[PDB]
């Protein structure tokens, strides 16, 4: 599938698991589903931190239905980015 070009919203509060990860429930606003969810994690400085995504190949099936995304944030301040473009959903996180 092609990468999602649209915007994402949070369907519910970000939930902390009992294994140092977070569950992000995202809602897709674009019209190009089925599509692959653009996902990235950054440090306080804004440098991309690799291999933090737990959910393998997150995909939007139906835009009306939200998608669960599990990610492992690093210790301290970080940023969880869902979607493509400069206007993408950027979540400030502290672990």
């Amino acid at each position, epitope marked *: 599938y092609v990468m999602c070009t649209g915007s994402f919203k949070l369907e519910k509060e970000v939930a902390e698991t009992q294994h140092g990860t977070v569950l992000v429930q995202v809602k897709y606003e674009g019209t190009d589903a089925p599509c692959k969810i653009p996902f990235s994690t950054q440090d306080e400085k804004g440098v991309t931190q690799n291999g933090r995504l737990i959910t393998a190949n997150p995909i939007v099936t139906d835009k009306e239905k939200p998608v669960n995304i599990e990610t492992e944030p690093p210790f301290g301040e970080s940023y969880i980015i869902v979607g493509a473009g400069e*206007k993408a959903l950027k979540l400030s996180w502290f672990k």
Partner: single-chain antibody, 233 residues
Framework: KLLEQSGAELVKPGASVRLSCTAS????????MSWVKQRPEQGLEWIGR????????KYDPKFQGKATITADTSSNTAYLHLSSLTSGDTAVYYCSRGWEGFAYWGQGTLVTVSAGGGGSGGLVMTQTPASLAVSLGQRATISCRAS??????????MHWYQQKAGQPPKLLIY???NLESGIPARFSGSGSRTDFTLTINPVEADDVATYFCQRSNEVPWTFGGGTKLEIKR
């Protein structure tokens, strides 16, 4: 419309009533379902929300001892239960879905409390101006000030709605500055933490409506008092 509500109710004072809200196309389990009260010609009042995945309920303190919210994921339905009905309960009740603004609304259910004795009644959002007389083609500005910080995860959970006569509200802006899909570019939002602004530039004839801001970072997900926008007379 993906949210279908039960029919109008005519109920006796002191009695109880249950309203239903059935979803189609998506699982209510995967969302936050809210109930919103609107007394005749008055503002939107957030009653509470249920997370049907775990059954968690949160209410505005004003509704404690008046409203109860339940959900049934099996039948994809959310319910509102009102106790000891009084004239103050006569209103249109809407169900809605969403956290970063309510993009989905039911058509509303009118509850009319009949005449007679019986029943009992049981964060600050400052929206200005209460009334706005506009010149078409001008820049129209509506402000909302919260008594507490509305930011979460470095984003401002401030949303804006438009409501036209005899219609449910429509989401315009979410997360303070993000334009809802299908909304014209003349609508823009700005602000952070406690101070926010909705700008309509240039204002057009079809923008005549009542506008509401709302915060949702933490409960209660309080609406502003509203701004009735009309063309100057």
């Amino acid at each position: 419309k993906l949210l279908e509500q039960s029919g109008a109710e005519l109920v006796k004072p002191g009695a109880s009533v249950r309203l239903s809200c059935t979803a189609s196309g998506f699982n209510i389990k995967d969302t936050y379902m809210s109930w919103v009260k609107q007394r005749p010609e008055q503002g939107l009042e957030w009653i509470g929300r249920i997370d049907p995945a775990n059954g968690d309920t949160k209410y505005d303190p004003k509704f404690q001892g008046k409203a109860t919210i339940t959900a049934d994921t099996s039948s994809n339905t959310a319910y509102l239960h009102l106790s000891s009905l009084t004239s103050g309960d006569t209103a249109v009740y809407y169900c809605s879905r969403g956290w970063e603004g309510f993009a989905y609304w039911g058509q509303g259910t009118l509850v009319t409390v009949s005449a007679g004795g019986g029943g009992s009644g049981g964060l600050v959002m400052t929206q200005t101006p209460a009334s706005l007389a506009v010149s078409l083609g001008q820049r129209a500005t509506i402000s909302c000030r919260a008594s507490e910080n509305v930011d979460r995860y470095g984003n401002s959970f401030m949303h804006w709605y438009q409501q036209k006569a005899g219609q449910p509200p429509k989401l315009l802006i979410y997360r303070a500055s993000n334009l809802e899909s299908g909304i014209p570019a003349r609508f823009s939002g700005s602000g952070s933490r406690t101070d926010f602004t909705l700008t309509i530039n240039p204002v057009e004839a079809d923008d005549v409506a009542t506008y509401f801001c709302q915060r949702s970072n933490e409960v209660p997900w309080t609406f502003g008092g509203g701004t009735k926008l009309e063309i100057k007379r």
